[PDB]
Amino acid sequence: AYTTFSATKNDQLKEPMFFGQPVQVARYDQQKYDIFEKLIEKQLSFFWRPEEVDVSRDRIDYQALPEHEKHIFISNLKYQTLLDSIQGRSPNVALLPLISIPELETWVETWAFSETIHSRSYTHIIRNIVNDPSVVFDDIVTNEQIQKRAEGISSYYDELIEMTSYWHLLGEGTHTVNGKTVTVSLRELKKKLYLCLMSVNALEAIRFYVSFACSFAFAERELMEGNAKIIRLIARDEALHLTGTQHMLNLLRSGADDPEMAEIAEECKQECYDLFVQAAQQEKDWADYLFRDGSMIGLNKDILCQYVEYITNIRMQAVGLDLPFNTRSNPIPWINTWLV
Amino acid sequence: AYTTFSATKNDQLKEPMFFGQPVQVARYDQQKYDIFEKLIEKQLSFFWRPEEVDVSRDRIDYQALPEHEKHIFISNLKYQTLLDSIQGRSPNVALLPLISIPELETWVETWAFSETIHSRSYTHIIRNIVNDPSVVFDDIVTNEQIQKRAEGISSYYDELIEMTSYWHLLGEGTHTVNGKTVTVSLRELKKKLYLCLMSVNALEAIRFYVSFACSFAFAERELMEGNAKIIRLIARDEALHLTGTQHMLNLLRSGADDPEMAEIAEECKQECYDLFVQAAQQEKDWADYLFRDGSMIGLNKDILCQYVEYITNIRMQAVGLDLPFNTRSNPIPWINTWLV
Numbered sequence: 025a026y027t028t029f030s031a032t033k034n035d036q037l038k039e040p041m042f043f044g045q046p047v048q049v050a051r052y053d054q055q056k057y058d059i060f061e062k063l064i065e066k067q068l069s070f071f072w073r074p075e076e077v078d079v080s081r082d083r084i085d086y087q088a089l090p091e092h093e094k095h096i097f098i099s100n101l102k103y104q105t106l107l108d109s110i111q112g113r114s115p116n117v118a119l120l121p122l123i124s125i126p127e128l129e130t131w132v133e134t135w136a137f138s139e140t141i142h143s144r145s146y147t148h149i150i151r152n153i154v155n156d157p158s159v160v161f162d163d164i165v166t167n168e169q170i171q172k173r174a175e176g177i178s179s180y181y182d183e184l185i186e187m188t189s190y191w192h193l194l195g196e197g198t199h200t201v202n203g204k205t206v207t208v209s210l211r212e213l214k215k216k217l218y219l220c221l222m223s224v225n226a227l228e229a230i231r232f233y234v235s236f237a238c239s240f241a242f243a244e245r246e247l248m249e250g251n252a253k254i255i256r257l258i259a260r261d262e263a264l265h266l267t268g269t270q271h272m273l274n275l276l277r278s279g280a281d282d283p284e285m286a287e288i289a290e291e292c293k294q295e296c297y298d299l300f301v302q303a304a305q306q307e308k309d310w311a312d313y314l315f316r317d318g319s320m321i322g323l324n325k326d327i328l329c330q331y332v333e334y335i336t337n338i339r340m341q342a343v344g345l346d347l348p349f350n351t352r353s354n355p356i357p358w359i360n361t362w363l364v
Numbered sequence: 365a366y367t368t369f370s371a372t373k374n375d376q377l378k379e380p381m382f383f384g385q386p387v388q389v390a391r392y393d394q395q396k397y398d399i400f401e402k403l404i405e406k407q408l409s410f411f412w413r414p415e416e417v418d419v420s421r422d423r424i425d426y427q428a429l430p431e432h433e434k435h436i437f438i439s440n441l442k443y444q445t446l447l448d449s450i451q452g453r454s455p456n457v458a459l460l461p462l463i464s465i466p467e468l469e470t471w472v473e474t475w476a477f478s479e480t481i482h483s484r485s486y487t488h489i490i491r492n493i494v495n496d497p498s499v500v501f502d503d504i505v506t507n508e509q510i511q512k513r514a515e516g517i518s519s520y521y522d523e524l525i526e527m528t529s530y531w532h533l534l535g536e537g538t539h540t541v542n543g544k545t546v547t548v549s550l551r552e553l554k555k556k557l558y559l560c561l562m563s564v565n566a567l568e569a570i571r572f573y574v575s576f577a578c579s580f581a582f583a584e585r586e587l588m589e590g591n592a593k594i595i596r597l598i599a600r601d602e603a604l605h606l607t608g609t610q611h612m613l614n615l616l617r618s619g620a621d622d623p624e625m626a627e628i629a630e631e632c633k634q635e636c637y638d639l640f641v642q643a644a645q646q647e648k649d650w651a652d653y654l655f656r657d658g659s660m661i662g663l664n665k666d667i668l669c670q671y672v673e674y675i676t677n678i679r680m681q682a683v684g685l686d687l688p689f690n691t692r693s694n695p696i697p698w699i700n701t702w703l704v
Contacts, residue, residue: 027518028457028458028517029450029514031511033505033506047453048449049445049449049505050448050452051487051497051501052483052487053487053490053491053501071411073408109388110368113387113460116473116476117366117456117457120457130452133473133477137477140390143391143470147392147393151393157393161391161393165373165389171371178367182366182368186533189533199542200540201539201541202539202541
């Protein structure tokens with residue numbers, strides 16, 4: 025049962041965020057949750073074009089970099105490119121078929137679109153600082169180490185899309201498909217979407233911010249100012265994207281939306297905690313590849329592991345989970361100048 | 365078998381537009397078909413927000429209109445709202461899991477996104493001209509003369525989405541699902557894509573143009589000018605979208621992108637021909653509903669039907685079909701003032 029235009033005249037204020045009737049009329053005169061409408065308007069105010077930022081001094085700054093700082097810069101760029109390539113298409117393929125209220129259907133499409141813009145700014149940077157872009161791009165797919173700190177991100181989205189396809193086609197029940205017993209359960213798909221949403225929150229609120237801090241390290245040295253203007257604009261969109269998932273998650277938790285989602289939130293709490301612990305440790309392991317050829321004066325593995333700890337405690341707090349790391353002050357308060 | 369980051373390193377310049385390996389890295393330095401990167405760029409420089417078009421005067425223009433004209437105006441606006449409600453979501457949920465080159469993936473998302481902006485301008489007009497938005501918006505879902513068409517459009521996308529899930533889940537073959545035999549054939553899924561794309565080409569290239577003619581008739585009499593400035597901007601976007609589907613269709617039937625789409629476009633030639641005559645006749649009929657209580661100045665059912673015949677011949681001709689109607693000069697040359 026998915027349809028692009030459902031023929032039941034319904035009250036779109038009484039639907040859940042997810043799993044109710046597919047949206048048919050897109051109206052903005054009213055909304056169940058104003059925050060998603062606020063976010064769409066704010067994102068639309070931030071419209072920027074990468075191509076209009078000057079990155080010409082960066083080819084000079086980059087070639088003047090020692091090989092090992094050149095490696096730190098490019099591995100960090102590569103991982104940013106991977107993440108927003110996944111973020112450009114995935115909100116639209118994984119969540120959009122499950123949404124039931126229009127402000128959130130348009131928010132998810134606006135958010136996915138702002139990530140296609142970020143992907144365009146990584147082509148803008150790479151093609152100006154490096155001579156054959158294809159050696160950077162091809163290496164993103166094949167690099168054992170980039171796939172390693174990213175382990176689990178596409179997996180999860182792909183598990184959700186498969187389960188949604190099963191539910192849309194067969195409906196709830198225990199079924200026989202090519203002599204295999206397949207059970208489709210809506211409670212389970214709801215657990216799957218809830219955990220998908222906690223992981224999207226960890227990827228935008230932690231993993232992108234650790235990368236941002238590696239980018240602005242150079243801007244503190246007065247290097248790579250074009251790259252830095254772009255990343256500041258990417259950070260500004262990223263704050264909206266994170267506010268979005270934090271509000272979806274906390275509204276699901278309150279029990280004001282779908283009552284089954286509030287029970288799942290409480291029932292899934294340990295899995296939520298563990299995935300943020302998982303994402304933190306993946307970010308800390310990456311440092312071993314990033315500082316492989318030696319580190320930089322303001323950026324080494326001890327600094328990085330300390331900001332990963334710092335930022336995870338903040339992020340887990342904002343969505344009401346127990347803090348895993350011992351409380352500490354911001355290791356790199358210069359990031360404050362450049363951010364969000 | 366759908367994935368959000370295919371781990372196979374692959375040369376994206378050699379992938380077909382559809383049904384090859386999912387796109388993993390989103391890059392814009394090179395492209396197999398330059399035309400989709402040229403459309404992303406025109407669509408980003410065409411960016412506008414409906415909030416800064418003042419529509420306030422249109423409230424009086426509309427109250428002053430004779431009831432039959434209020435009816436032609438609001439019925440036309442309702443149909444436009446129905447079509448971009450389907451067009452914000454549907455490019456994304458239906459085409460995006462089938463695309464295998466990056467520049468076409470980002471065009472589909474940019475395209476979907478410019479449609480949510482169109483949806484938002486319609487709430488912007490409605491809010492300022494009738495002030496109980498709900499009597500317009502709920503009547504979109506139930507209205508018999510409108511519902512007529514929605515059903516046809518949603519059908520194409522809904523069967524392609526249902527078939528695509530079967531292919532992604534089970535692959536080609538004869539499968540059994542709870543006692544039934546289900547045959548999944550990629551040849552048949554390619555047919556569904558072709559005719560779905562053909563129907564969207566009619567949607568943006570004909571159905572939307574017939575509706576622009578009714579909006580601009582008010583603008584010719586210096587009525588509904590807020591609305592007319594907005595439809596101008598929407599019409600400018602429509603021109604890009606139509607260029608999108610015309611290029612994809614002609615690249616498919618030329619055999620250049622997939623030899624087998626050339627075969628299918630030839631077997632599906634008479635079905636495509638009827639598809640278009642049916643869209644045209646559905647538009648001709650709609651005019652009878654509009655002009656039931658009497659016509660207005662500059663437009664009447666004869667004029668409008670003539671305009672439908674003319675726009676349908678220009679569009680069929682552009683996708684290599686034979687013309688069904690008597691060759692004609694444009695019946696309302698004044699509309700070129702408002703169009704591209």
